[PDB]
Amino acid sequence: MTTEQEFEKVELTADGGVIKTILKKGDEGEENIPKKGNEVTVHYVGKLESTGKVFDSSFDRNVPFKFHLEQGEVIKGWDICVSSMRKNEKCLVRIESMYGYGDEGCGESIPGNSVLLFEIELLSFRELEHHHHHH
């Protein structure tokens, strides 16, 4: 009956140091692993934790925007989350200044070196073997 789940955060995971919170866990899937360099489809949404401001724009709550993993658009914040997701799993990731485009300044909703939360749910993915076959 928990409305506020007592979840732990993963602070600086070994995949390049990103903060993500475990919400749902992948039930089972050996082949069910979305990794970088491969094509994945996910939706992102949430709020600005930096001030607790919930998202309310004409675009974010309306348009289903999705990116692909490792297309150069994603740096680290999404990268660690999606490359460690599962098709039946879900985590909340923290987009910090260095985890996002706080360097270049190119953001979407409110990119001001603030910490934002995006719920990433990997509904579609496809592991493509693009490496030389040893055997």
Side-chain angles (χ1 to χ4, degrees), residues 67-123:
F67 55 81
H68 310 278
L69 180 48
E70 259 294 64
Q71 49 180 27
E73 305 301 280
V74 298
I75 42 277
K76 292 264 59 65
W78 304 282
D79 177 57
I80 270 62
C81 191
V82 294
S83 190
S84 179
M85 277 281 71
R86 289 163 180 117
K87 187 178 179 300
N88 286 270
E89 187 169 275
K90 178 181 174 178
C91 293
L92 242 173
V93 62
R94 293 309 198 287
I95 290 69
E96 187 178 66
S97 50
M98 63 173 299
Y99 299 156
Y101 274 102
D103 172 79
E104 186 165 72
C106 185
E108 306 196 288
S109 47
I110 49 281
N113 290 32
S114 313
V115 55
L116 291 80
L117 334 91
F118 295 143
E119 299 182 80
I120 295 180
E121 191 166 273
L122 190 112
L123 61 152

